[PDB]
Subunit: 277 residues, 2 copies
């Protein structure tokens, strides 16, 4: 049954990082800092509310691992690129958009009916957090029908920018995939540049979406002369998208399978009704 504890102790790592950011944020920014930006009380109210919701989300996770006789995960050391209040919202937004894929991946290995429903219940609470910051940062609170899973190593890639060091064997992040741009409508040619000189023999863009799964495609070339590969957002995708470099044609659903992944993923904010214009 060690599958379940692995998933849970993984999610506790997600929550340590999540809750550690909200404690330090509420402890360093005030309500009027929000009003100073054009935010209302209910926003800081909710922001505090997100903090508490994380502490329970971390708390429930530790106390479960214990009640199955496991060892709860010590946290890691974190760094948060927070300047003004507007940055706090992007840290939160990207933090919160990352729990839906993390949880949905982690739920596939949690075996118990009861254990699943307490966890799917936290999944929901974070979906509100995601839509809250999303709406609060110009994005659509509900950009699409269905949210897709990713793997532990994929979550680690997305978090890797925040984790400074881990006092234990964490999930290993793939190198960061840099998208240019990181948002926009179907068809955006996006300048993907990896952060390590990896093998380009056989790499196919993976456009991971919740509603269509992983759409496969072969990269192009930036006319720029920079020489960075470009994927193009395919038709029929909705919601939140994860773009990654994969090597191989035998690995299909990348959301549940990191075996072929070489670079990234990184999130892409597909246009959706609800987007502030």
């Amino acid at each position: 049954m060690d599958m379940t504890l692995d998933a849970l102790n993984f999610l506790l790592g997600v929550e340590h990082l999540a809750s550690a950011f909200y404690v330090q944020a509420v402890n360093n920014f005030t309500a009027d800092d929000f009003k100073a930006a054009g935010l209302a009380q209910r926003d800081y109210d909710q922001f505090v509310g997100v903090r508490n919701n994380e502490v329970d989300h971390r708390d429930t996770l530790i106390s479960v691992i214990k009640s199955l006789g496991g060892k709860p995960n010590p946290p890691c050391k974190y760094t948060f690129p927070v300047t003004d209040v507007a940055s706090v919202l992007k840290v939160s937004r990207t933090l919160e958009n990352a729990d839906k894929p993390a949880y949905l991946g982690a739920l596939r290995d949690i075996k118990s009916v009861e254990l699943r429903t307490s966890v799917q219940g936290a999944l929901s609470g974070d979906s509100a957090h995601a839509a809250f910051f999303a709406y609060l940062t110009g994005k659509a609170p509900a950009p699409g029908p269905v949210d897709g899973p990713l793997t532990q190593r994929h979550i680690a890639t997305l978090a890797q920018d925040f984790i400074v060091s881990c006092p234990y064997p964490a999930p290993k992040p793939f190198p960061k995939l840099t998208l240019s741009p990181q948002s926009g409508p179907v068809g955006t040619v996006v300048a993907t540049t990896c952060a390590q000189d990896v093998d380009t023999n056989g790499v196919m863009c993976a456009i991971i979406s919740g509603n269509q799964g992983t759409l496969m495609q072969r990269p192009g070339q930036a006319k720029d002369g920079s020489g960075a590969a470009t994927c193009t957002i395919p038709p029929g995708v909705k919601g939140i998208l994860f773009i990654a470099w994969v090597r191989g044609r035998d690995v299909l659903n990348v959301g549940v399978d990191d075996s072929s992944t070489v670079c990234g993923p990184n999130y892409f904010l597909l246009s959706a009704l609800g987007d502030a214009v």
Copy 2:
């Protein structure tokens, strides 16, 4: 495999209703109604997006039950007490709040890792729906850390006010448990009145919570003397509450077990950080 097909079908009913609302809602309201009501164009945008996701969520369900050798359920006859734009948002909030218990109830019985991950992904998009309308109706979009299940029947109990007739035999509802008040902080005394003259001998309040589960208390007496039994919200409950009447004390988690339910549940809007004051 039986268990799965009844649960996907139960959810189809819920999206048949859900889809039905939002197609007529965007059909009878435009941006300028929202613009007049003190809302920005983007909120209409996300609203039509809510319709599109609901359509996606019904069809996705339909598309799957047919795939396992099953008969998708037809839609039911529907009633929508809608007048102004203010009324649409309120009812909106009522149905998205119903989804979270409705889906978590379903997910207890879908027996397959893959069917579950695509339905959790759907449930996930539904919290984004709920947080949006919670935010738009002056409520906390994430009122709590964790959301609870309800049974299929309790969902029919909350749905019965919009369901006229069902061409198939649907989940049989419980008597409405009108609640008064239907929103307040811990400490509020609620005026529970059933709709059928049920036998008071044995009844118990079941304040259904997401974090604590389901807590029973002895029905109060109406401080006015109206006979109208009263419940009081216990402490350390967050998020969304469900208040039903239960005969006896054998069923301790009534969120997954309705064999002792006699009236309700109805929803309770617990005051949370994020509410508008």
